[PDB]
């Protein structure tokens, strides 16, 4: 049961999303430190989606939780600064995974 998710869709991996905090040093900090954050994110299928926002936040919390729990259990943690930078990344990755799978649905009417 994916360690203890009940059954969140663990997505596949990614490459560096284009986070733009509005700052300069944050973007550079992120670009040096991006390895500290996961490749992949946890969510539900578009088959039972309803809300973007509520689904996004619940993913964001649950992948934040897992990095801050299923790594912190051993001895692996972050800072408020890394954590907020993670909230950006976890969102962009979560958003992208929904967008990938739901666009496959919304594009999936072009037998043209």
Dihedral sign (CA 10, 54, 88, 78): negative
What's the per-residue H, E or C state across the chain? CCCCCCCCEECCCCCCCCCCCCCCHHHHHHHHHHHHCCCCCEECCHHHCCCHHHHHHHHHHHHHHHHHHCCCCCCCCCCHHHHHHHHHHHHHHHHHHHHHHHHHHHHCCCCC
Give the residue carrying structure tokens 């649905």: 105
User: What are the structural domains, with CATH classification, of the chain?
Assistant: 1-112 (1.10.790.10)
Technique used to solve these coordinates: NMR
């Amino acid at each position: 049961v994916v360690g203890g998710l009940g059954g969140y869709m663990l997505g596949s991996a990614m490459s560096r999303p284009m986070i733009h905090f509005g700052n300069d040093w944050e973007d550079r900090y992120y670009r040096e430190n991006m390895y500290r954050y996961p490749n992949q994110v946890y969510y539900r299928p578009v088959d039972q989606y309803s809300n973007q926002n509520n689904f996004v936040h619940d993913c964001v919390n649950i992948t934040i939780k897992q990095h801050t729990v299923t790594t912190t259990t051993k001895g692996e943690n972050f800072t408020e600064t890394d954590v907020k930078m993670m909230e950006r990344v976890v969102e962009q990755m979560c958003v992208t995974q929904y967008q990938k799978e739901s666009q496959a649905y919304y594009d999936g009417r072009r037998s043209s």
